[PDB]
Amino acid sequence: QVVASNETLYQVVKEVKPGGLVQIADGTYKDVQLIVSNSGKSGLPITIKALNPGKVFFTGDAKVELRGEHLILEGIWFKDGNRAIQAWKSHGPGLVAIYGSYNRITACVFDCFDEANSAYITTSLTEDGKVPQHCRIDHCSFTDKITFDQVINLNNTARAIKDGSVGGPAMYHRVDHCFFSNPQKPGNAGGGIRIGYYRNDIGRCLVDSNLFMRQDSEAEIITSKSQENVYYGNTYLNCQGTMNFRHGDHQVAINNFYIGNDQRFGYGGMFVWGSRHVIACNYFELSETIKSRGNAALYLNPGAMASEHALAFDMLIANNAFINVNGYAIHFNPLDERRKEYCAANRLKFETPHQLMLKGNLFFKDKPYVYPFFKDDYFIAGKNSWTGNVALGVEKGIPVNISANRSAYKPVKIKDIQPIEGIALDLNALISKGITGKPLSWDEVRPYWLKEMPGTYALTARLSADRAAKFKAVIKRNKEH
Numbered sequence: 001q002v003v004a005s006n007e008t009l010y011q012v013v014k015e016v017k018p019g020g021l022v023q024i025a026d027g028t029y030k031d032v033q034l035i036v037s038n039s040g041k042s043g044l045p046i047t048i049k050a051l052n053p054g055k056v057f058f059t060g061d062a063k064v065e066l067r068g069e070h071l072i073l074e075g076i077w078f079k080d081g082n083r084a085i086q087a088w089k090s091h092g093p094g095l096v097a098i099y100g101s102y103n104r105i106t107a108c109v110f111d112c113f114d115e116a117n118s119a120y121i122t123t124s125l126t127e128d129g130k131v132p133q134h135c136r137i138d139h140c141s142f143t144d145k146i147t148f149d150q151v152i153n154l155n156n157t158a159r160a161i162k163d164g165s166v167g168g169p170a171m172y173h174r175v176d177h178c179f180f181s182n183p184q185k186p187g188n189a190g191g192g193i194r195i196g197y198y199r200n201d202i203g204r205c206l207v208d209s210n211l212f213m214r215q216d217s218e219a220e221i222i223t224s225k226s227q228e229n230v231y232y233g234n235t236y237l238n239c240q241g242t243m244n245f246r247h248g249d250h251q252v253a254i255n256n257f258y259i260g261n262d263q264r265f266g267y268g269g270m271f272v273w274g275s276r277h278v279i280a281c282n283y284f285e286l287s288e289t290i291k292s293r294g295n296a297a298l299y300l301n302p303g304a305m306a307s308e309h310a311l312a313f314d315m316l317i318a319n320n321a322f323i324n325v326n327g328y329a330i331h332f333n334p335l336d337e338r339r340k341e342y343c344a345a346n347r348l349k350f351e352t353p354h355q356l357m358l359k360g361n362l363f364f365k366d367k368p369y370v371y372p373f374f375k376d377d378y379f380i381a382g383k384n385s386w387t388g389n390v391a392l393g394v395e396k397g398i399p400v401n402i403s404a405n406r407s408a409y410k411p412v413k414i415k416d417i418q419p420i421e422g423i424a425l426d427l428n429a430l431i432s433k434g435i436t437g438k439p440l441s442w443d444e445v446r447p448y449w450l451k452e453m454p455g456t457y458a459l460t461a462r463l464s465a466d467r468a469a470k471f472k473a474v475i476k477r478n479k480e481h
């Protein structure tokens, strides 16, 4: 039914049946506490949507909880929030918290919501430990986030100091066609998306066709902290951060675009911990790279095998292109001094990346940047395997013989790569095709009803005066008195 107030919305959601449709009349729903406990059924979802998307605002001291299964939340604009700062935390539920499985949030806008620390959307465990699975977040816009924590956390365990061999279960979520552009916070402030917590967690989430444009929240654009997540066809445009395989082996990134096209800041880029990954058909063209990480497109972590800073080794790096990177194409030992400190403290064995299979990559420069393609301060003959690469335009920086024949450059065919269970992509086929398509634009990901890009930061790299003032107040209250 059509509802036009908070109270009527609360009532209709208590009664709605599988296949039901709740439409919210034009207006502002201030301090709205939408808790949806009922469930739809497979093929009979319950849809809660604006009657006219773009005309419904959830504001004030608001929250949404999707606790039932088979629910769809659509066409809501979250702005002008005022949740209690003492009542919300990073690593807690999001503004929208999804506790049930088979739920979808689509074509919603989150724009500088408030000053309370939390994600904008989470999947969250219930108190009895049940893990939501098979959820989708798509065609949503996340802009000008001025609070701590990620924009989205996808959770399969409760936060703990941890380290017990039993990880969280596979989630099988999808995040697609979303737009992220958010200002830099201080420190380890929470990024774009976190998936899982530690290396025994299984993710099996698909993150595809998103546009991260000045996603600058903190060092990590995405902190992927579970196994077997697949990142396909995302665009990272002028982002002050890197997309990271932070914990969890056997993750996949194929045909993403990492573009930096001005000199305003250092941009990234991928930072990779762990082993057994597939990193293929990605395109890196970065006009400036990140000083603090080591100035590179692709960073391969040194350290102790399978530790808290897991050594990057034994993986496939295939058919990628590094075009006019103002930095190393590949840095084989970033942050090595900090990592030796970690390994010494914990009495762990420090190692450097090896057993890498570098196949069919193009390394090309014709602009006067000063960096050789590679940095490997621990180079050992034979430790990695290079086949079918092409390198031309600057010295390699390591003693490896690579063809310089660009005309003869072709991506390699690959046929031995196992797909990820639950994700309907043919990894061999996609890798063997080489790099397809081009960077995504706002029109390709935007909510169907929204023509104008929201936010103040994406086009300008600066918050508007009023939002800047709120951001300063958040940062101040979160640091030492």
Ligand SMILES: *[C@H]1O[C@H](CO)[C@@H](O[C@@H]2O[C@@H](C)[C@H](O)[C@@H](O)[C@H]2O)[C@H](O)[C@@H]1O[C@H]1O[C@H](C(=O)O)[C@@H](O[C@@H]2OC[C@@H](O[C@@H]3O[C@@H](C)[C@@H](O[C@@H]4O[C@H](CO)[C@@H](O)[C@H](O)[C@H]4O)[C@@H](O[C@H]4O[C@H](CO)[C@H](O)[C@H](O)[C@H]4O)[C@@H]3OC)[C@H](O)[C@H]2O)[C@H](O)[C@H]1O
Binding pocket: 176, 177, 208, 209, 232, 233, 234, 255, 436, 437, 438, 439, 440, 444, 445
């Ligand atoms: C993410 O998305 C981006 C693009 O937004 C992709 O970008 C590309 O790749 C990047 C690497 C590059 O950077 C970029 O430049 C791009 O080149 C990126 O790869 C990622 O892709 C994934 O997301 C896509 C997306 O969501 O946009 C997926 O594309 C969708 O795939 C499904 C398509 O639907 C099918 O085709 C349409 C036209 C429907 O079929 C037609 O149905 C008509 C009416 O029934 C009929 O007359 C026609 O004969 C049919 O052809 C659809 O059918 C389904 O729906 C209809 C109603 O419309 C009926 O109910 C049917 O029963 C039902 O089957 C087809 O579904 C199979 C959709 O068009 C397409 O957008 C992509 O596959 C993902 O990998």
Ligand SMILES: CC(=O)N[C@@H]1[C@@H](O[C@@H]2OC(C(=O)O)=C[C@H](O)[C@H]2O)[C@@H](OS(=O)(=O)O)[C@@H](CO)O[C@@H]1O
Binding pocket: 102, 103, 104, 133, 134, 135, 136, 172, 173, 174, 206, 422, 423, 424
């Ligand atoms: C709630 C939702 O859309 N979940 C996504 C899931 O889609 C469900 O499962 C399938 C399926 O064929 O396995 C189809 C329907 O779209 C839906 O029931 C699926 O999303 S996808 O279909 O857009 O690809 C996965 C990705 O595999 O992500 C969510 O789990």
Ligand SMILES: CC(=O)N[C@@H]1[C@@H](O[C@@H]2OC(C(=O)O)=C[C@H](O)[C@H]2O)[C@@H](OS(=O)(=O)O)[C@@H](CO)O[C@H]1O
Binding pocket: 090, 148, 149, 185, 186, 187, 188, 189, 190, 478
């Ligand atoms: C709110 C927030 O997450 N801020 C990050 C800092 O964490 C807070 O401050 C401290 C502290 O001892 O100084 C401890 C608590 O975690 C928070 O109250 C801190 O993050 S972290 O180091 O704890 O992971 C700094 C580190 O640079 O990052 C801020 O973003």
Ligand SMILES: CC(=O)N[C@@H]1[C@@H](O[C@@H]2OC(C(=O)O)=C[C@H](O)[C@H]2O)[C@@H](OS(=O)(=O)O)[C@@H](CO)O[C@H]1O
Binding pocket: 090, 148, 149, 150, 188, 189, 190, 191, 194, 197, 220, 223, 246, 308
């Ligand atoms: C100890 C702790 O929980 N600190 C939180 C951070 O987590 C550490 O940092 C990261 C990371 O990739 O940033 C990985 C380590 O394994 C963690 O011990 C971090 O939280 S999270 O969202 O990345 O899990 C920050 C983010 O705001 O929050 C700290 O409190």
Ligand SMILES: CC(=O)N[C@@H]1[C@@H](O[C@@H]2OC(C(=O)O)=C[C@H](O)[C@H]2O)[C@@H](OS(=O)(=O)O)[C@@H](CO)O[C@H]1O
Binding pocket: 188, 219, 220, 335, 338
């Ligand atoms: C406790 C810990 O190792 N946390 C990792 C982060 O490391 C801290 O972050 C930084 C920084 O500027 O990024 C400075 C502090 O001295 C570090 O202790 C960080 O890891 S990394 O930067 O060493 O690679 C994040 C990933 O960005 O992961 C945390 O686990």
Ligand SMILES: [Ca+2]
Binding pocket: 188, 189, 190, 191, 218, 219, 220, 223
């Ligand atoms: Ca972080």
